[PDB]
Amino acid sequence: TNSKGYRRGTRDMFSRPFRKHGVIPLSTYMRVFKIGDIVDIKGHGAVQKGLPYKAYHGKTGRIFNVTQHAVGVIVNKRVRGKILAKRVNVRIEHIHHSKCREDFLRRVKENERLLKEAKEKGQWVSLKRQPEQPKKAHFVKKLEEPIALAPIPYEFIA
Amino acid sequence: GRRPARCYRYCKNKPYPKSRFCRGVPDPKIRIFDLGRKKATVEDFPLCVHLVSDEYEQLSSEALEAGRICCNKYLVKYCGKDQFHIRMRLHPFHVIRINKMLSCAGADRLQTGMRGAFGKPQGTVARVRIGQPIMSVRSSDRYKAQVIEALRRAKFKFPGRQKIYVSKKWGFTKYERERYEELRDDNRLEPDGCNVKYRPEHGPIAAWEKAQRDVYA
Amino acid sequence: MVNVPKQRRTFCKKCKVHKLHKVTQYKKSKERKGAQGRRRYDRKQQGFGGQTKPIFRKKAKTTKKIVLRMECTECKYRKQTPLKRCKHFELGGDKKRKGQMIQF
Amino acid sequence: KNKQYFKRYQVKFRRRREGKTDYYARKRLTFQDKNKYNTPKYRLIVRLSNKDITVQIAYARIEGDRVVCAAYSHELPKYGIQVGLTNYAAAYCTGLLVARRVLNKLGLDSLYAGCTEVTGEEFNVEPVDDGPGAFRCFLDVGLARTTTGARVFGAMKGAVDGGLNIPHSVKRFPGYSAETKSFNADVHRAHIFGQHVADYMRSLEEEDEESFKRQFSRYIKLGIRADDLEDIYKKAHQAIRNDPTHKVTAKKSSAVTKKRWNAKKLTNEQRKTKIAAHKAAYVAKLQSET
Amino acid sequence: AKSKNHTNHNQNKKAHRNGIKRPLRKRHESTLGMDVKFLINQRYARKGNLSREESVKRYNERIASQKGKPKPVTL
Amino acid sequence: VRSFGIRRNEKIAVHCTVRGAKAEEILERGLKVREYELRRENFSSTGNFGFGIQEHIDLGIKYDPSIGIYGLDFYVVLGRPGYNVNHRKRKSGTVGFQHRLTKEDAMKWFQQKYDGIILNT
RNA sequence: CAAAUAAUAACGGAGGUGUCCCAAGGCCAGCUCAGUGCGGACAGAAACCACACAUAGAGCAAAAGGGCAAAUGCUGACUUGAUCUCGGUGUUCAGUACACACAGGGACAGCAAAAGCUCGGCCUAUCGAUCCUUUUGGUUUAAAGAGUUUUUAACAAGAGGUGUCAGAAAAGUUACCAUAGGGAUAACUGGCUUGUGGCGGCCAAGCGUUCAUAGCGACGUCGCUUUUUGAUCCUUCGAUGUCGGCUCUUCCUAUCAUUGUGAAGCAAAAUUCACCAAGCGUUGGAUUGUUCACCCAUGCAAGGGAACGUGAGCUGGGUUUA
RNA sequence: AAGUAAGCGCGGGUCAACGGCGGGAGUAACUAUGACUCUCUUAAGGUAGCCAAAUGCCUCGUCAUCUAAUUAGUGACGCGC
RNA sequence: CAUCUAGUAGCUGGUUCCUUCCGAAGUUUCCCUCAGGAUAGCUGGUGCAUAUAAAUAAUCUUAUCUGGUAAAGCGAAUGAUUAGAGGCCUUAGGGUCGAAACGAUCUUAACCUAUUCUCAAACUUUAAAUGGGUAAGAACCUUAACUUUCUUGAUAUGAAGAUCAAGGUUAUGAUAUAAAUGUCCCAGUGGGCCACUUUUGGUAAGCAGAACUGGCGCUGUGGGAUGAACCAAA
RNA sequence: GCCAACGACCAUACCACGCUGAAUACAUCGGUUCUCGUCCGAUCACCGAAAUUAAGCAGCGUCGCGGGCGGUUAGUACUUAGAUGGGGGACCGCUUGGGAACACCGCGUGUUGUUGGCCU
């Protein structure tokens, strides 16, 4: 009967990776964080100041604040069963940029590049994503060394 | 009090070791794992024969101790004194405990009736798996028939069921007998006691001419 | 033997600036009559009720937090701040020595 | 040591493996706030050598520092100083050369002239009104030992004489003693104009006159005498204040394919034929056994 | 007599009924616990917008009277 | 130790070091005391070598019973130019194989300078 | 433990806390630690000096864990940011408190040439409401007829303490006992369970003059048996009379004897092993309340148990009210 | 702030007041045993007696007696829970 | 004996008409609290804001981040552990042919190096499945040049904000039991129990304790002869 | 083809050796009056010029170690979901999807940004 307290169970959460110990690379402090930016939390065990508490590791929020060393990130925690949006002041070394939306934003960049040159053709602009449709009718040619090439089900004996 | 493994037959739990965290673990009265001519070379004993578990049992230390002596005493009686190497490949680092209830004098009431349960380590056992060997005897091919009966006599002192496999290997090395004979026929099997050394292309080159200075000279 | 200096250079909020202060202790300055909650205590137990009020046995702590008075040298202005709990405490008294011989 | 701490071996970065960077100072020199979002900070980097003084202005960007102004000591022959390129005196030129090199291209030489009245006092430029102040640098010394009177502090007073706003204290200027401070501008003024290099070569024709052919050689070759240095450096402090034009050269265009020397490394077909004859002629040499 | 404490049984049936409830999406989220010197006369970066188009596209040529600030902003 | 009587920080020894052309006073002044012919090891693999003499008044020192006689410890570290490559704080490095001088080039330096014999014991 | 987010139980397992610290806090600079190798008089397994290797194998008041190498380690330098203030957030959470951490704003200061962001201890523990008392504090507000000084009060911030730690002020005994309830809870029956005992079957080291199994039978191994005996708490506390003996009936077979047999290391006699087999039988006493075991004796021969069998069947010796 | 009454504290008496009344070694010609010695202590170390007792756990003590046979009885014995 | 007195009871018992509709809880924290509260959750009632898209909200696909469990591993570290093999050696435990011999075999055990058997609740280079989070558009995407003391820069180009400009086809799939929001903080509840799977203690248990989802409680009916829970179906 | 200062990613860059090296450089190097620091001008600080096969980033070489990427292990291990499937149990088959790891073999052995120069 514990969780309680504050870095418990984080023997593997705030560990370092293997041979990624030591000095922090310098671009970690050279990243720019503007208000309203999507941001993951993966805490740094080698920076003992401004670590998020363990519920928020692995999560994802939006930057609501910038101060001199940290960003306020607003993160969702399910406190059962309901979702509060938690405001967590977290230092910059524990904070990353989300890649999730900058491969949505390279489609807004193409839902206006492809609708641009569609002023000549007209249609279909085809600006929606399609799931993996079932395949087609297609003519598999053999030739290729005609078949059989015939498996039979056999591997036991030892 | 050395109660047997007769009623142990649901075994559940992650292996508690004899480590720096349950210190008080005893000296084992079951120590030796291997016997026969254990100083024999690779070339002496081509035949390997295993006793292989086709269940998921929990083989005891006293079962494994008993089965080695019955495999020993038949082989030193029939196939020669030192024409074998028995390797007992199940080293039992397990802790089976016992809640002992010191209930002498019938009146004390203090220690444990069902509250509370710390244990005391008495057992030591080996998990086997399917297809996983239990002991391998290495001997010549003249005593192939004498080998299997000593493993048969060891079967009836283990729980579960077990299958006696003549392995098609050449000894305890992980080679086919043909692939042992071909690879030893040029240079590449540089021998040791139990095992050979393998197929070296690296590194760097100094132990290539040392082979070539000892294939010709 | 937790060691504290007799003099501290710290903020005084009457000169609004760091001055030099002199550190002291506090103990208690015992209770008057009449305090209010003592004049009221003394009329409950005017006689024939018989112990109208709790009596605190079952105490638990060994230590106390030390109230370090810090009087200012210029304005003569005393602040206080508590330190943590510790068993022995001394004002001034022999800064520890760095790397000398271990005396038996 | 044998294959198994090599597996667990974590190198240091690349430059701390090679002595170049602190990374405990590089972390703290290149610190910008996060509510100062992408503003550069432009530190002042004077690195010494044996026969060069590299002064630079670089700002912290991710794919490398970007160098915005770079004045060296191997160009001060163009401004009237031929030898003694790594002086305490010859740094204040490359200090002053890198400040006037950058305020003309930023247009901040009409305002923020500087200190041509070179005295050695503490000089902190008050901001020219109608707007904020001037270009700020911060001095980045590396792990030069910052004891008082080093040449690395001989480019901070040079650059602050051009007019740049680099934060100060005179504690490490040559001629400010340690009991107390005791400001003294004159030993700083002596060192600025190269007086104590002149005084040593005015004190060496009294003790050991043969040692001119030792230390302070090549003054004998180029004819620089000791009384000239207070006016060699003085007339250089306006010839530098009059032509800071970056020394850009145009070969046009000889950098790539020069011309003959690509230096290929043993294509793996050759390495497997290198150890074709290395193996075949060894056993033929072992056929000279029989 | 000491019966049965601690279970998360029924606790997600019972928490999925009135459902598991995202907060709600606002166009105006609060500025509180935010950097106060970022906010305190950016209050007056709003209050300096007395006009925004009439007197303001006058400014595009009022500073192009001095040809803008095209060069010297490049430090 | 409790066997010699020393503890933490009990100030047992006194040493100094002499570098460069003033050692060649105190080297050869204490080497003819050892009558320059010196033992064989006595010669480290790191290229330094050294010896020890008792009777400290053979260094041109008068006996002077106000101080007493003493036995000393002479260690001669030895090296080529470029050995400050690992000693600078900025942009350091290591010396390599050649240069780095063996035992048998300190002995080679000793059969020539002071003309000693290596005394195979 | 815990089942790859977080959460998560048992009187689960392994430990730790109630402190220590003027440096062991703050910060700059210099420095490299465990160990290892070759050396250097006394000097050895270790004293010290010095070189070369050393991925942290050291050290950091840290219990364990994470972390850390021109440091957070070691040494020096000055130092008091272990300061004043005002909110906000994280944890625990009811999204309350304290408390602990954090990220800021406003000062004022330390170190540093400077960048640097120092709001105690590298991080995760090291602690505490109301009322009361008591300091510091405004250079104060009130005592209600009005001034003056003392006194008291009030307000801000600390301290004094609640270790059952969200915080009564608290020793037994009852077999003389009472009440409300409880099968949410013991004592006996019934149920499940069997570690303990025993009864079987495999393998055969061996014992048996010789002979592995006439008769045995080690080390192992797989089952059956709850009744003793624990474990359990399901049914019963508006009550199921709680040990034995006496009486009397029925049932089992795990067979003592007898019938019918097979086997012996079976000559006869006597015995031993096993098979079909529950029909008839399995007694009289001394001592003890016993229940088993023991004793005298008879007996061809003196087996083991079931309805905890059996108190409106008795008895009342055990146990057990005054 | 002095001086202050009883009571307490300090001092003495008292056990047919309430109550209590110890260990560990070494030694005598076969063994055995310990009159004897040393020592640790205590307010005093359980004396005269008595006893497996209506009082002894071990235990149905051991010996004798009583009986054909006695976990009972009686007589003894005694480091006596 | 009479009164105070209908003393008090977190405890037992009982609590009186029909149909219709909706439908629980045995968990959280805290309490001299453990047969009880208060608290939050779960419930109902009563509304109200929006009816002749591009409003959104919930299981999959896509994009991205997270994770150290299964497996894997010990010829990687830390802990174990089994056997030999090749040897530095000068550690010898002394040897052996010899007074010790170095004149030779080396004998063995140390130590070193290439291998080896077998493994870890409080080990791990690697590392799934099932999971956790986020995103998938007018609340948008590119502009233009204005405001700012706080804001930064020597920039009244930053960074936030306030405006005009220009943008085919609202930017996976499937759904919409109507969803949103308040109030009575509204009643009951706060003994649970069973099962697959994973689990801890225990020799075991129709035993003790947990995670997950589904069930009985609260529920008839079909099947399993029989039966709380199983199979089917409400 | 390179050289330097400042870097980013932080071993494809490291480690062990070996062998080259034009030119700018970078060094080692010389000295201690000055500023500065040591027990010591070795280190640090400062003045600044008399010889090169050590640093240095390399040019590299190595059937190199490590590290890196691919292949193969392997549709293997495990695992989602299913059954009135099996078996005395332990556990195992199949259905429905998802899908590792050691090793093993092969491959390559820093990539680049800004600013100043050199040209074998």
UniProtKB/Swiss-Prot annotation, chain B:
Transmembrane segments: none annotated. One of its GO terms (molecular function) is structural constituent of ribosome. Keywords: Ribonucleoprotein, Ribosomal protein. GO terms for biological process: cytoplasmic translation; translation. Pfam families: Ribosomal_L16 (PF00252). InterPro entries: Ribosomal_uL16, Ribosomal_uL16_CS_euk_arc, Ribosomal_uL16_dom, Ribosomal_uL16_euk_arch, Ribosomal_uL16_sf. One of its GO terms (cellular component) is cytoplasm. It comes from the Eukaryota. Component of the large ribosomal subunit. Mature ribosomes consist of a small (40S) and a large (60S) subunit. The 40S subunit contains about 33 different proteins and 1 molecule of RNA (18S). The 60S subunit contains about 49 different proteins and 3 molecules of RNA (28S, 5.8S and 5S). Belongs to the universal ribosomal protein uL16 family. This is Large ribosomal subunit protein uL16. The lineage of its organism: Eukaryota, Metazoa, Ecdysozoa, Arthropoda, Hexapoda. The gene is RpL10.
Swiss-Prot record, chain D:
GO terms for biological process: cytoplasmic translation; ribosomal large subunit assembly. Its main location: cytoplasm. It is found in: Cytoplasm; Nucleus. Keywords: Cytoplasm, Nucleus, Ribonucleoprotein, Ribosomal protein, RNA-binding, rRNA-binding. GO terms for cellular component: cytosolic large ribosomal subunit; cytosolic ribosome; nucleus. The keyword Iron does not apply. It comes from the Eukaryota. CDD domains: Ribosomal_L18_L5e (cd00432). GO terms for molecular function: 5S rRNA binding; RNA binding; structural constituent of ribosome. Belongs to the universal ribosomal protein uL18 family. Component of the ribosome, a large ribonucleoprotein complex responsible for the synthesis of proteins in the cell. The small ribosomal subunit (SSU) binds messenger RNAs (mRNAs) and translates the encoded message by selecting cognate aminoacyl-transfer RNA (tRNA) molecules. The large subunit (LSU) contains the ribosomal catalytic site termed the peptidyl transferase center (PTC), which catalyzes the formation of peptide bonds, thereby polymerizing the amino acids delivered by tRNAs into a polypeptide chain. Component of the large ribosomal subunit (LSU). Interacts with Fmr1 to form the RNA-induced silencing complex (RISC), a ribonucleoprotein (RNP) complex involved in translation regulation, other components of the complex are Rm62, RpL11, AGO2 and Dcr-1. PANTHER family: LARGE RIBOSOMAL SUBUNIT PROTEIN UL18, RIBOSOMAL PROTEIN L5-RELATED. The gene is RpL5.
Swiss-Prot record, chain E:
The modification Phosphoserine is found at residue 30. Disulfide bonds: none annotated. Residues 50-61 have a biased composition (Basic and acidic residues). The keyword Mitochondrion does not apply. Residues 1-32, 46-75 are annotated as: Disordered. Belongs to the eukaryotic ribosomal protein eL29 family. This is Large ribosomal subunit protein eL29. It comes from Drosophila melanogaster. The lineage of its organism: Eukaryota, Metazoa, Ecdysozoa, Arthropoda, Hexapoda.
UniProtKB/Swiss-Prot annotation, chain F:
Its main location: nucleus. It is found in: Nucleus; Cytoplasm. One of its GO terms (molecular function) is rRNA binding. The keyword Ion transport does not apply. Keywords: Cytoplasm, Nucleus, Ribonucleoprotein, Ribosomal protein, RNA-binding, rRNA-binding. One of its GO terms (cellular component) is cytoplasm. One of its GO terms (biological process) is cytoplasmic translation. Belongs to the universal ribosomal protein uL5 family. Component of the ribosome, a large ribonucleoprotein complex responsible for the synthesis of proteins in the cell. The small ribosomal subunit (SSU) binds messenger RNAs (mRNAs) and translates the encoded message by selecting cognate aminoacyl-transfer RNA (tRNA) molecules. The large subunit (LSU) contains the ribosomal catalytic site termed the peptidyl transferase center (PTC), which catalyzes the formation of peptide bonds, thereby polymerizing the amino acids delivered by tRNAs into a polypeptide chain. Component of the large ribosomal subunit. Interacts with Fmr1 to form the RNA-induced silencing complex (RISC), a ribonucleoprotein (RNP) complex involved in translation regulation, other components of the complex are RpL5, Rm62, AGO2 and Dcr-1. This is Large ribosomal subunit protein uL5. The lineage of its organism: Eukaryota, Metazoa, Ecdysozoa, Arthropoda, Hexapoda.
